[PDB]
Design an enzyme around this catalytic site. Structure first.
Site, PDB file in Angstrom:
ATOM      1  N   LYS A   1       0.567  14.695  19.631  1.00 50.92           N
ATOM      2  CA  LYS A   1      -0.697  13.705  19.902  1.00 50.92           C
ATOM      3  C   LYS A   1      -1.401  14.336  21.119  1.00 50.92           C
ATOM      4  O   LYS A   1      -2.370  13.761  21.413  1.00 50.92           O
ATOM      5  CB  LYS A   1       0.162  12.376  20.073  1.00 50.92           C
ATOM      6  CG  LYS A   1       0.736  11.857  18.696  1.00 50.92           C
ATOM      7  CD  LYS A   1       0.581  10.299  18.556  1.00 50.92           C
ATOM      8  CE  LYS A   1       1.936   9.888  17.948  1.00 50.92           C
ATOM      9  NZ  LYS A   1       3.098   9.867  18.694  1.00 50.92           N
TER      10      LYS A   1
ATOM     11  N   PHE B   1       8.115  23.876  25.171  1.00 49.36           N
ATOM     12  CA  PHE B   1       9.058  24.737  25.721  1.00 49.36           C
ATOM     13  C   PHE B   1      10.534  23.554  25.807  1.00 49.36           C
ATOM     14  O   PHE B   1      11.767  24.174  25.145  1.00 49.36           O
ATOM     15  CB  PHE B   1       8.837  25.135  27.001  1.00 49.36           C
ATOM     16  CG  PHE B   1       9.928  25.157  28.040  1.00 49.36           C
ATOM     17  CD1 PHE B   1      11.140  25.966  27.717  1.00 49.36           C
ATOM     18  CD2 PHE B   1      10.255  24.461  29.280  1.00 49.36           C
ATOM     19  CE1 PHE B   1      12.211  26.325  28.787  1.00 49.36           C
ATOM     20  CE2 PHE B   1      11.168  24.358  29.864  1.00 49.36           C
ATOM     21  CZ  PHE B   1      12.241  25.297  29.718  1.00 49.36           C
TER      22      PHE B   1
ATOM     23  N   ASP C   1      15.337  21.903  22.948  1.00 54.60           N
ATOM     24  CA  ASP C   1      16.143  20.539  22.374  1.00 54.60           C
ATOM     25  C   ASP C   1      16.391  20.626  21.037  1.00 54.60           C
ATOM     26  O   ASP C   1      17.378  20.103  20.711  1.00 54.60           O
ATOM     27  CB  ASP C   1      15.169  19.399  22.846  1.00 54.60           C
ATOM     28  CG  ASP C   1      15.387  19.252  24.273  1.00 54.60           C
ATOM     29  OD1 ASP C   1      15.829  19.709  24.949  1.00 54.60           O
ATOM     30  OD2 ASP C   1      14.441  18.175  24.861  1.00 54.60           O
TER      31      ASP C   1
ATOM     32  N   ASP D   1      20.268  20.249  19.578  1.00 54.82           N
ATOM     33  CA  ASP D   1      21.118  19.162  18.625  1.00 54.82           C
ATOM     34  C   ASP D   1      20.895  19.370  17.295  1.00 54.82           C
ATOM     35  O   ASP D   1      21.088  18.664  16.399  1.00 54.82           O
ATOM     36  CB  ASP D   1      20.497  17.783  19.119  1.00 54.82           C
ATOM     37  CG  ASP D   1      18.833  18.108  19.262  1.00 54.82           C
ATOM     38  OD1 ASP D   1      18.313  18.477  18.378  1.00 54.82           O
ATOM     39  OD2 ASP D   1      18.339  17.316  20.482  1.00 54.82           O
TER      40      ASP D   1
ATOM     41  N   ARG E   1      10.638  18.595  13.148  1.00 58.26           N
ATOM     42  CA  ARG E   1       9.875  18.106  14.325  1.00 58.26           C
ATOM     43  C   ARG E   1       8.478  18.164  14.035  1.00 58.26           C
ATOM     44  O   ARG E   1       7.672  18.798  13.311  1.00 58.26           O
ATOM     45  CB  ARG E   1      10.106  19.433  15.487  1.00 58.26           C
ATOM     46  CG  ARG E   1       8.627  19.254  16.363  1.00 58.26           C
ATOM     47  CD  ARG E   1       9.297  18.132  17.514  1.00 58.26           C
ATOM     48  NE  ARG E   1      10.474  18.293  18.247  1.00 58.26           N
ATOM     49  CZ  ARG E   1      11.136  17.441  19.109  1.00 58.26           C
ATOM     50  NH1 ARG E   1      10.154  16.363  19.031  1.00 58.26           N
ATOM     51  NH2 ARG E   1      12.188  17.508  19.632  1.00 58.26           N
TER      52      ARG E   1
ATOM     53  N   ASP F   1      21.971  13.785  29.644  1.00 55.24           N
ATOM     54  CA  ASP F   1      22.203  13.126  28.402  1.00 55.24           C
ATOM     55  C   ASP F   1      23.159  13.744  27.597  1.00 55.24           C
ATOM     56  O   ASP F   1      24.056  13.309  26.769  1.00 55.24           O
ATOM     57  CB  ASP F   1      20.692  13.440  27.719  1.00 55.24           C
ATOM     58  CG  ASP F   1      20.522  12.558  26.523  1.00 55.24           C
ATOM     59  OD1 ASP F   1      21.201  11.465  26.328  1.00 55.24           O
ATOM     60  OD2 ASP F   1      19.943  13.110  25.600  1.00 55.24           O
TER      61      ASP F   1
ATOM     62  N   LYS G   1      14.879  12.931  32.340  1.00 52.98           N
ATOM     63  CA  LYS G   1      14.766  13.842  31.037  1.00 52.98           C
ATOM     64  C   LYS G   1      13.384  13.461  30.543  1.00 52.98           C
ATOM     65  O   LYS G   1      12.839  14.173  29.794  1.00 52.98           O
ATOM     66  CB  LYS G   1      15.718  13.602  30.215  1.00 52.98           C
ATOM     67  CG  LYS G   1      15.329  14.281  28.673  1.00 52.98           C
ATOM     68  CD  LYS G   1      16.657  13.840  27.678  1.00 52.98           C
ATOM     69  CE  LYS G   1      16.043  14.270  26.245  1.00 52.98           C
ATOM     70  NZ  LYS G   1      17.063  14.833  25.316  1.00 52.98           N
TER      71      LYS G   1
ATOM     72  N   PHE H   1       8.311   2.969  28.153  1.00 48.74           N
ATOM     73  CA  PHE H   1       7.996   3.839  27.002  1.00 48.74           C
ATOM     74  C   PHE H   1       9.089   4.327  26.338  1.00 48.74           C
ATOM     75  O   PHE H   1       9.155   4.035  25.240  1.00 48.74           O
ATOM     76  CB  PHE H   1       7.438   5.076  27.545  1.00 48.74           C
ATOM     77  CG  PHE H   1       6.951   6.230  26.802  1.00 48.74           C
ATOM     78  CD1 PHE H   1       6.152   6.255  25.662  1.00 48.74           C
ATOM     79  CD2 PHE H   1       7.968   7.190  26.597  1.00 48.74           C
ATOM     80  CE1 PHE H   1       6.147   7.244  24.907  1.00 48.74           C
ATOM     81  CE2 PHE H   1       7.866   8.280  25.664  1.00 48.74           C
ATOM     82  CZ  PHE H   1       6.831   8.220  24.660  1.00 48.74           C
TER      83      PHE H   1
ATOM     84  N   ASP I   1      10.398   3.091  22.655  1.00 40.52           N
ATOM     85  CA  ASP I   1      10.583   3.981  21.614  1.00 40.52           C
ATOM     86  C   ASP I   1      12.023   3.876  20.988  1.00 40.52           C
ATOM     87  O   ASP I   1      12.162   4.251  19.890  1.00 40.52           O
ATOM     88  CB  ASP I   1      10.343   5.382  22.402  1.00 40.52           C
ATOM     89  CG  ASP I   1      10.696   6.423  21.132  1.00 40.52           C
ATOM     90  OD1 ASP I   1       9.547   6.829  20.706  1.00 40.52           O
ATOM     91  OD2 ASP I   1      11.454   7.123  21.281  1.00 40.52           O
ATOM     92  N   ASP I   2      13.242   3.379  21.691  1.00 41.67           N
ATOM     93  CA  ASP I   2      14.490   3.251  21.255  1.00 41.67           C
ATOM     94  C   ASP I   2      14.550   2.053  20.247  1.00 41.67           C
ATOM     95  O   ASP I   2      15.142   1.972  19.408  1.00 41.67           O
ATOM     96  CB  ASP I   2      15.246   3.262  22.388  1.00 41.67           C
ATOM     97  CG  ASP I   2      15.698   4.480  23.264  1.00 41.67           C
ATOM     98  OD1 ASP I   2      14.907   5.499  22.848  1.00 41.67           O
ATOM     99  OD2 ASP I   2      16.387   4.447  24.194  1.00 41.67           O
TER     100      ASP I   2
HETATM  101  O1  LIG Z   1       2.207  10.468  22.418  1.00 40.65           O
HETATM  102  C1  LIG Z   1       3.166   9.810  22.671  1.00 40.65           C
HETATM  103  O2  LIG Z   1       4.432  10.466  22.382  1.00 40.65           O
HETATM  104  C2  LIG Z   1       3.166   8.500  23.006  1.00 40.65           C
HETATM  105  N1  LIG Z   1       1.904   7.879  23.465  1.00 40.65           N
HETATM  106  C3  LIG Z   1       1.048   7.442  22.464  1.00 40.65           C
HETATM  107  C4  LIG Z   1       1.092   6.975  21.254  1.00 40.65           C
HETATM  108  O3  LIG Z   1       0.347   7.490  20.089  1.00 40.65           O
HETATM  109  O4  LIG Z   1       1.909   6.103  20.892  1.00 40.65           O
HETATM  110  C5  LIG Z   1      -0.385   7.216  23.114  1.00 40.65           C
HETATM  111  C6  LIG Z   1      -0.257   7.706  24.634  1.00 40.65           C
HETATM  112  C7  LIG Z   1      -0.844   7.550  25.738  1.00 40.65           C
HETATM  113  C8  LIG Z   1      -0.803   8.279  26.797  1.00 40.65           C
HETATM  114  C9  LIG Z   1       0.566   8.985  26.967  1.00 40.65           C
HETATM  115  C10 LIG Z   1       0.853   9.460  28.194  1.00 40.65           C
HETATM  116  C11 LIG Z   1       2.084  10.150  28.339  1.00 40.65           C
HETATM  117  C12 LIG Z   1       3.026  10.245  27.400  1.00 40.65           C
HETATM  118  C13 LIG Z   1       2.833   9.628  26.294  1.00 40.65           C
HETATM  119  C14 LIG Z   1       1.270   8.706  25.784  1.00 40.65           C
HETATM  120  C15 LIG Z   1       1.192   8.328  24.611  1.00 40.65           C
END
Ligand SMILES: O=C(O)Cn1c(C(=O)O)cc2ccc3ccccc3c21
Ligand SMILES: O=C(O)Cn1c(C(=O)O)cc2ccc3ccccc3c21
Lengths: 341, 341
Positions: free
Chosen positions: B48, B89, B94, B98, B103, B165, B191, B230, B234-235
């Site tokens: 993303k 990287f 990673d 594991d 991915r 971890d 991490k 965050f 996510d978890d």
């Molecule tokens: O991309 C991701 O893993 C989670 N994410 C999302 C998402 O589409 O959920 C939007 C967004 C915006 C800023 C971020 C900055 C640092 C790390 C992850 C970010 C992020």
């Protein structure tokens, strides 16, 4: 020389102390730091220490003794150990990549019960430790940025070399056609000679305030050439070496290595000798490998090596005469003496 | 925002051009550089891009628009991509560690036919590419050394985190006793949170000339906390997430992850609930995992998450009020808005 090697190993214990201690303000990560300590002690100890030791020897020969205070020499000791850590990082990773069993007679870190592929993160930590030390001991020095960049360029060049090598000898692919002399010399230069010979001397140079691009280009011309001989001789000793004075027995044939020996053999060899090397170059059976070994002697390779070595030796002297100044020739000649012996 | 993400991906093609071209004075290494190109294109593309994109967004909000010439913005684009390369990287490495299969829905680089453990050197090259770009585009800038050190510290901290971890969830060892909240938050910080949230904003800060230790310490206090939410979220989404709007289905239970969910469950749970989680936490059978999932709902965890999220959201606002100045709060609030949604 083998007295200085004692003071160098001596310093490892402080290196470890200073590295395994950001847990002071951070008890949270204690378990991680303990693993780091174990990684350092298994992997940075047990070789000949010649690369890192070269930094220190070179440093003394480059900088005024009245400039060599307790702190200066301390940083020399640390940067040399930084070279060793860069090496420990390559080796741990290289051992996994080609599924080796032993290193320095001892079990490869990744082969230990409970380590396995975690050694990949271990390897990366070894690399990171370099830059922690440089910041801890050299942050304030004017050559600080120079050393970071030198270490980083040495990483990148070694890695390009490892790539070249991996493309060249795809384990599971015996195509003798990509073993040209030109690909050989290209692999030795990137994967071995830059970090093994240029890096140590370059580091001492920067530490002694010699940052001039021409002086480094000149020191590089000599050192890369010394590196090329070093690996070529190592490829020769791998096989025809005397296993008693060397330190172990060789396997370059049993691994489909792009060895100097095999580049030479192919550069000669009638098309029957072509397809019998193309027949035994790889297998583990001592009958099939000793077959190629024979074909080598039959092509007099050990002779063309002994010629190569003398020619190489006079070339490097011509290079020192020409490109050493204004550095003391001793810095290059001390090296030449230890490699060519 | 999702318009800027277009100009960012757009720049990858130049990044690749500039990286895969020291073969100019060095045709010797062409085959290696071609592999590097393939490594970059498989591994840096397809996520993303939010971390790298955050560098660019942050840069604009921090530096005067009349200071934002074509060259400045060019370096912003490159440093953001440097963040992405640091991530590529970690991920490649990673994935090997594991033994993941996929991915981004796609086959893990190391799982491709003909790559395998060579991906370890590939991963290292991705890391090295960061510093080649920084030297190519930022060598002359006054924040040059700052960015090298920031990237290096982010590598080291992530690696410590990966160690923590790996010690914590030894794949092949279901010891629920080392899954404390304190070890959880320690793993998320090193991490994940440092490189994911602090690094991007810190990089833009240095680029905008804000190198002050207190300002970074203040920006770090906010960003680390955002990072903690965050990963916790996510978890949570891993399991109770809506697989349609997320992007894939979760496996944290099936992997013995030190998930937030399981830390919570254990922090509650009667000693019968203790030993039935201690019974199903790991297996691949959908009957055994859906068992734990149930035990979670039974402990109302999804509720304590929804409470946690609101509390977390007001805490981060309090943090922005307090510690944002003299940075424009927008820089932190733009982030908060996208994470908490
Ligand atoms: O991309 C991701 O893993 C989670 N994410 C999302 C998402 O589409 O959920 C939007 C967004 C915006 C800023 C971020 C900055 C640092 C790390 C992850 C970010 C992020
Ligand atoms: O240690 C080695 O691998 C080979 N070697 C030896 C040996 O004991 O054979 C002596 C010596 C001296 C200086 C060196 C500098 C750089 C790289 C290797 C060096 C080296």
């Amino acid at each position: 020389y083998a007295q200085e090697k004692q003071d160098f190993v001596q310093h490892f214990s402080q290196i470890v102390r200073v590295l395994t201690e950001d847990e002071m303000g951070h008890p949270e990560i204690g378990d991680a730091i303990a693993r780091l300590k174990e990684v350092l002690e298994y992997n940075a100890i047990g070789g000949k220490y010649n690369r890192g030791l070269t930094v220190v020897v070179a440093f003394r020969e480059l900088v005024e003794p009245r400039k060599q205070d307790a702190d200066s020499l301390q940083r020399a000791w640390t940067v040399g150990w930084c070279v060793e850590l860069l090496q420990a990082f390559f080796l741990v990773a290289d051992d996994i990549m080609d599924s080796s069993l032993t290193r320095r007679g001892q079990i490869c870190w990744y082969q230990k019960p409970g380590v396995g592929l975690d050694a990949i993160n271990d390897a990366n930590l070894l690399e990171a430790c370099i830059y922690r030390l440089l910041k801890l001991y050299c942050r304030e020095q004017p050559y600080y940025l120079n050393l970071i960049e030198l270490f980083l360029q040495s990483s990148y060049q070694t890695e390009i070399g490892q790539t070249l090598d991996l493309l060249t000898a795809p384990q599971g692919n015996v195509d003798l056609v990509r073993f040209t002399e030109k690909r050989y010399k290209s692999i030795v230069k990137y994967k071995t000679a830059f970090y093994s010979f240029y890096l140590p001397i370059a580091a001492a140079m920067y530490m002694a305030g010699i940052d001039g691009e021409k002086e480094h280009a000149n020191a590089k011309k000599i050192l890369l050439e010394m590196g090329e001989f070093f690996q070529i001789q190592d490829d020769y000793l791998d096989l025809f070496g005397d296993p008693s004075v060397t330190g172990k027995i060789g396997t370059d044939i049993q691994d489909n290595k792009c060895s100097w020996l095999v580049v030479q053999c192919l550069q000669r060899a009638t098309p029957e000798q072509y397809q019998i090397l193309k027949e035994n170059y790889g297998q583990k059976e001592a009958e099939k490998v000793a077959r190629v070994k024979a074909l080598y002697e039959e092509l007099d390779l050990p002779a063309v090596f002994l010629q190569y070595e003398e020619d190489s030796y006079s070339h490097i002297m011509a290079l020192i005469e020409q490109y050493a100044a204004p550095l003391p020739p001793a810095v290059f000649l001390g090296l030449a003496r230890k490699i060519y012996k």
